[PDB]
């Protein structure tokens, strides 16, 4: 059964863990428990194909930034997450992108830009600004909410589709 | 930082995932989503020492039995879980222990016998009988409930102490 190694990356607090847990447990976690490194395996059906998703939920805290090199070498696709109510998290996206491109030594790494917390009314990042950044990278952009589940399945399925295109 | 590699093993349905999620997230999962393989890295203080617990939540489905060798080699201590309302799960304990002993090529591997679902009134395994089994193995026995949190911290901390007391 085809396996896809997906890695969720982004600034500390954007909702990487909440997105992953919502996808896998169908449960929204309101608590903030900073992650070191957690991994999940889930069997799903995407476009009629049964897939195994190997999801790595990474640390946004810079304390654990030395762990990035190994997960970027093995990761097949990257979910690059920012929060729509956190200007700094959007600015931190390009750093994750640049690091992934450098480790992979490639410009066409499967990625999806995710603008999380779209359920909140405190927006500080314009959807247009995010769409434009995704165009400069030539990657899809999807807005999500780990709380309401808006766009969650779409963000992970799209990333799997990006890996399939690249194979 | 001292790291402890803990592996949660047992028959399908005993509550391995519910115990792990209760330990880490302090809530009880009513849903039954069979596990393939999930991992968690969590920082905790045990006996005044800051520890890193690497917890592997394994598959109880007998279909994934070929995956056991690798996690038994890597694992330092094993939480051997049965459910007090499932006699097959209690008898399956012997098979998990014999497999661990064989991979490790040792008779004294850190283990803790856990009798989960102790909140339920449908008991089929007497506490005395579980206690006698743990005594024959020379390991600690604790009854737990992933629902009420009874014995959960004690089961994981005791296993860390077994790894520590073995070193
Ligand atoms: N309203 C709302 N809150 C969210 C959403 N996603 C995550 N959160 C909240 O933001 C906080 C951080 O979520 P978390 O999943 O821990 O973020 P993280 O990026 O994994 C944190 P770390 O990098 O340290 O592991 C939590 O309080 C969580 O409930 C969302 O889509 N909507
Ligand atoms: N009453 C009660 N129910 C529990 C307890 N622990 C787990 N359960 C329940 O048993 C079912 C299976 O729990 P789960 O944690 O998935 O068990 P598992 O051993 O991980 C199953 P698998 O081996 O396939 O991964 C769920 O309905 C869950 O709510 C408990 O301590 N008490
Ligand atoms: C016991 N496994 C549990 C799964 C694992 C955490 C991790 N899976 C790997 O195969 C692997 C191999 C080398 C380095 C990193 C990894 C991880 C990885 C990266 C990207 C996406 C998923 C994911 N799964 C590794 C440890
Ligand atoms: Mg996290
Ligand atoms: Mg499980």
Residue numbers in the entry:
A (entry chain B), B (entry chain A): 1 to 167
From the paper:
Although KRAS could serve as an excellent target for many cancers, no therapeutic agent directly targeting RAS has been clinically approved. The main reason for this is the lack of druggable pockets on the surface of RAS. The shallow, polar pocket situated between the switch I and switch II region of KRAS (SI/II‐pocket) is of particular interest because it is present in the active, oncogenic form of KRAS.
The complementary “kinked” docking pose of 12 b in the SI/II‐pocket of KRAS encouraged us to generate a sub‐library of 1383 rotenoid‐like “kinked” molecules with contiguous fused rings from our corporate database for a second virtual screening campaign. To ensure that the shape complementarity between the rigid three‐dimensional topology of our “kinked” library and the KRAS protein were assessed accurately, we developed a “snugness‐of‐fit” scoring function. The “kinked” library was virtually screened in an analogous procedure to that used for the vDNP, with the addition of the “snugness of fit” scoring function for pose post‐processing. After visual inspection, 7 compounds were selected for NMR testing and the racemic compound 15 showed NMR cross peak shifts. Both enantiomers 15 R and 15 S docked with conserved indole binding modes; hence, the racemate 15 was separated into its two enantiomers 15 R (2R,3S) and 15 S (2S,3R). Enantiomer 15 R was successfully soaked into the crystallography system with the crystal structure confirming the docking pose. 15 R binds to the SI/II‐pocket of active KRAS and forms two chelating H‐bonds to D54 with an N−O distance of 2.9 and 3.0 Å, respectively, and a weaker third H‐bond to the K9 side chain through the carbonyl group with an O−N distance of 3.4 Å.
